[PDB]
Symmetry: C3
Subunit: 105 residues, 3 copies
């Protein structure tokens, strides 16, 4: 483990998300994992400003965004100009927890 | 970091076995608590089994008082009441497989 | 953590998969986790030769195969004669990341 950021983000509708970013070295490979939790429900996209460390981490993904599975539906996390966006495929009465990762050489 | 790791096997009347692992981790200002669940068995109704006091204690700590958990074929809710662990499922599962549920807190 | 193998595997349609195998000891219990990532899409099964360490890890599962949930669908990983197979329930336009684990005494 060469990194562990955690932070809580909030929009003005009141929704809170906690994120954890983690980096791990495995010989030739690196793993980067995003962890997300919210107790809230969500109907539209979630937008909130992120710290520079998180924005930096989130930009590193090879696809420029993080496909993430929650118990009730699927989201895409991306960052743009220090604004974090989580878009969802369907409205979620509760978000819950999920993670998204990639492995790289 | 890791300030806790309980693991146990629980069993019901039919003979359905679940293994659980509870984990706590400290991340500066934040704590993460993760429940991991595995069963090779299929499940049609709810799974009820007695849990150790450490596990019951861990499971009760959740801000919603229950653990929403995704398995490969369906969704479950884990809760504890009076030292009885209950896993309720949205649909019957021919195989449970593995899943995790966590939360982050300040 | 008593083990961490990671490798990249590749098939004839251009699809690359990264796998990480992990073993952890927890007092009386062991946990074995497979992690899988691919940025590619996948229509049929994914077949690729694996290292001996990975074949060995994958054979250890009590069911002889790993049921694994990806954001858009479900897969079964198994190994036979050092050939890794990932079968899918539906075609996946993108595979993303997932893990599968078991606990044992």
């Amino acid at each position: 483990t060469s990194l562990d950021i955690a932070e809580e983000l909030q929009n003005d509708k009141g929704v809170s998300f906690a994120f954890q970013a983690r980096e791990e070295e495995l010989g030739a490979f690196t793993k980067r994992t995003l962890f997300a939790y919210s107790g809230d429900g969500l109907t539209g996209p979630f937008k909130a400003p992120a710290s520079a460390e998180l924005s930096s981490f989130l930009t590193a993904h090879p696809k420029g965004r993080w496909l993430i599975a929650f118990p009730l539906g699927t989201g895409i996390v991306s960052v743009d100009e220090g604004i974090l966006t989580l878009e969802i495929s369907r409205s979620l009465p509760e978000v819950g927890s999920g993670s998204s990762f990639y492995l790289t050489e």
